[PDB]
Amino acid sequence: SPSQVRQNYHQDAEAAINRQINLELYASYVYLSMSCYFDRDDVALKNFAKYFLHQSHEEREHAEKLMKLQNQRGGRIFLQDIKKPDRDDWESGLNAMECALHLEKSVNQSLLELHKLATDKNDPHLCDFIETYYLSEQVKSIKELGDHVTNLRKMGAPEAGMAEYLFDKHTLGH
Amino acid sequence: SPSQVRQNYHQDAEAAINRQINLELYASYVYLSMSCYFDRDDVALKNFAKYFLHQSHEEREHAEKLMKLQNQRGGRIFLQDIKKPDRDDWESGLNAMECALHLEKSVNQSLLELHKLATDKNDPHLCDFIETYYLSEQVKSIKELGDHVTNLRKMGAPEAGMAEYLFDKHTLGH
Amino acid sequence: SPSQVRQNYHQDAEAAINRQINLELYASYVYLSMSCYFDRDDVALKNFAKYFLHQSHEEREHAEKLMKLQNQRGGRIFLQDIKKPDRDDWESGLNAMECALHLEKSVNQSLLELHKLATDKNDPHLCDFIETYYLSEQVKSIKELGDHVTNLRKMGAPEAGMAEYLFDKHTLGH
Amino acid sequence: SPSQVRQNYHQDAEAAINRQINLELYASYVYLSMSCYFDRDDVALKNFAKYFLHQSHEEREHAEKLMKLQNQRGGRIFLQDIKKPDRDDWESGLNAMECALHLEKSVNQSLLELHKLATDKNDPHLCDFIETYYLSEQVKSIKELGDHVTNLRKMGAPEAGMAEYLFDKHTLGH
Amino acid sequence: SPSQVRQNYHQDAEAAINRQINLELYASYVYLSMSCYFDRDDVALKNFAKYFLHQSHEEREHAEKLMKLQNQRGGRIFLQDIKKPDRDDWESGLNAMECALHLEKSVNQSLLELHKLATDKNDPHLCDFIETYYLSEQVKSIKELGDHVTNLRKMGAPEAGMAEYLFDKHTLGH
Amino acid sequence: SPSQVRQNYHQDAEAAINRQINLELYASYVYLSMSCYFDRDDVALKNFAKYFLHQSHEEREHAEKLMKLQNQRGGRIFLQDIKKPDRDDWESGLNAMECALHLEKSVNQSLLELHKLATDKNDPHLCDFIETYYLSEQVKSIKELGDHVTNLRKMGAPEAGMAEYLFDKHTLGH
Ligand SMILES: [Mg+2]
Ligand SMILES: [Mg+2]
Ligand SMILES: [Mg+2]
Ligand SMILES: [Mg+2]
Ligand SMILES: [Mg+2]
Ligand SMILES: [Mg+2]
């Protein structure tokens, strides 16, 4: 019954990795939601919509790397339902950015508990994997979103009106 | 309250399009499941896994075209939960292909009810849209999967063993 | 017994499409006839013969698209005899052009009854197909032949003699 | 007396298409008017003037496609007077954009009545034509103008003064 | 109230230039009419239709240069209705050419009264403008149309029938 | 009444060549039939369908060379009905190949009687023509089909199931 390729892969880890897969697919669905919002004809911020559409595609690629890992180690993937996003209508460019940042910190929090459970089961390949592909880029994302939120607040979003518009063109529009 | 760009777009259609979006995202999740299965170390059919991974990416692109349509016409997108796939373990290459085909016919059935409701509300742009981008490629998909299922059955899958292996290399491996 | 790929394809349509296939193959045979006539050593209008030979090849390509359609939808093709053309000897360049035009209108008339029967069975993919590939180019053909017949009559074909000759070089000879 | 190429083309449609031609030429004249306004030495928004000049040229190209259609089907074109635009002086960038949008919806409304009259006379080629070349791009225009009006209002046009200026450079100036 | 850029621009000239704009737009509409006529399925002279379509596009470009001039000098543009062309059906290639020539002489006559009114108000820039861009090319047009009318009459249009046909291919078809 | 270019062309030959034209058009229709069969969604052998579609196009080119010959020698072409193929459904890849081979031998048999009748009327150009363009390639076709039938039988078609599938990819799929 155990996989021919299975070696030093504890059950508690296999279960934790399945939960992290469901968490990345759900983040991917949240960015997709926001992207729909900024494409609305009475919000109309195209560069915001392209920005979150890209984040969406990147999160779906994190889920699939984890899907490969779990097959390489001889664990089995058990998919669950992907819950709908907290809300449909996201108010403003600055409110969507602050939720993105809150979301991205929670994904980060779960990877750090994942890493703490692999260190305490003595699984070095799994740890190295999380470190090399997840923890580092998750810290670059948070820092970037932290900077976007800072700039928008300074320019006086959302009360200013010209702030998101200029932000859309200069910072997100390359 | 009604969108500035809204014109000849009945409520019953806006609701139908939201349900079709949830149906494409769910198909996308089912292909993703199958792809995980053929990558398993004790199934090991790489060209099958690449085939369904591509179908997965294509269905997620159908959902996003529909997301654009609904914004262009001034309707609003209301995302629901995406339910987990019927099963986790898909038996064989021929059983996965027969379920793919059964799935793809149900997506087709819902587009034909969508088109019947747009014709009976007199919405010509919505009809043209469904016809030009959905109904045609949905018929090419079904015909292709119908042919794959036919060949596999003839070569004697799944009892033969060499049938999926050869099928994987010649028909799916370009 | 019913095809695995068959869906929303009424028997009355499958029968109508078979009759339209026989009608395109017969048109293809009529153009082939005319082309033989203008190659005759005592008619001798080479650019007329090249013109109808091309129309012949185009009609045989319409029949084969319809042959593909009927297989994609899971209907079955039932070929009949192709009847010989009304006549062997076609008098003149202007008489051959007026028969071509009368022929091309009858092909058009049958596609419009085909489309009226698919709309009344609720088959949207079949309708879109006929519209996108048949009705439009059938209207461009009729308009072109209508213009050729007009010019020839004006220049005084067939009594003039120099009219077809000049027509052969300037309008049909690029 | 009836055209040699005429087939399944009802009189009521020929009359409707003539009225739609006069409607596109009149829209073309309105955009030309606005373009003159933004070139005025005491408005001075060059990128607005280039934007409406282009819309003007596009509408004159819609009228000529319809002029071709009506000749291909063997109807006759009956040109009327083109009435002068509602006003000469258009106040602001945001007021010109809101009138453009109101205009573009009325052109859309007339194409949808045109399509409803071709469906009820059973003219499939005419319907396909309107759908494929008019209804789709008319919906992309409305959505775009809807977005421009939204942005300008948000930035605080016309009271702001810097809003149109920045809008002219970033959104319309490529 | 007077424009900041206005200098040596008499009211009587501003009014004359507005009337010349309406005259070029009306000529543009007349050529458009003729072009529709030669595209008719029972006239069928394609190179005649391309010839007048081009003249149409050129006249619409003369109107827009005048629209720029009037803005550069700080006058205001007051658009009127564009009246429908004298007739719908233009008989023959030679009759359409003789009306084109009569039209083009009347446009010329109005530019010469325009120039006589700018010389008698002492406006040198306006005079130079009319001379450099209008009077010269208006004389080349008349001479060309004069030559086309001469040739057609000689070959025996419209009684000959082969005359317009050959004319269409050799003189207008490059 | 006799053609100006007619020389040493006996009536009995002109009649024989007309019958051979009808025989090539009928072979062309039979290959077209088979090609439709292998494109069926429950046969599904694409490389077989491409193979017979090509043979179809080649036979229609043999008929047209003969149509040219008969015009060059000053005979007249008298087209007959093209009869429908013996059957609609062709069982298997090996059964279709054995009928193709039986068909291709009968075409060969008629060319050899044609050549025997031209030698006994003393028509050397007609003989050379048949020899140089027909008899040689007809012998290469038969030998090829003879080899395909041999291989399929050896691999154990049609009972094997994997035989046609592999044959489709290696021998017919280049
Ligand atoms: Mg991640
Ligand atoms: Mg789809
Ligand atoms: Mg056709
Ligand atoms: Mg339009
Ligand atoms: Mg001029
Ligand atoms: Mg042959």
Author numbering:
A (entry chain A), B (entry chain A), C (entry chain A), D (entry chain A), E (entry chain A), F (entry chain A): 1 to 174
Extract from the study:
Interestingly, most of the reconstructions resolved at a resolution of 2 Å or better correspond to apoferritin from various organisms, as a result of its high symmetry and intrinsic stability. Indeed, apoferritin is now commonly used as a standard sample to assess microscope performance and implement developments in cryo-EM. We show that basic settings for automated cryo-electron microscopy imaging using the Glacios® electron microscope, often thought of as a “screening microscope”, allow structure determination at high resolution.
In particular, iterations of particle-based CTF refinement, followed by particle-based polishing and beam-induced motion correction procedures were critical factors in increasing the resolution of the final reconstruction of mouse apoferritin from 3.6 Å to 2.7 Å. The Coulomb potential map clearly resolves densities for all secondary structure elements of apoferritin (helices A-E and Loop L), with the appearance of main chain carbonyl oxygens consistent with the FSC-calculated resolution. Side chains are generally well resolved, with the unambiguous observation of cisPro161 underlining the quality of the reconstruction. The 2.7 Å 200 kV cryo-EM potential map also revealed density for 72 solvent molecules, compared to an average of 121 +/- 24 water molecules per monomer of the asymmetric unit in the 2.24 Å X-ray crystallographic structure. Two putative cations could also be located (although their identification cannot be determined from the present cryo-EM map alone): an iron ion on the fourfold symmetry axis and a magnesium ion at the ferroxidase site of the monomer. Nevertheless, the densities for negatively charged amino acid residues are consistently lower in the cryo-EM map, a phenomenon that is likely to be more prominent in 200 keV than in 300 keV reconstructions due to increased inelastic scattering.
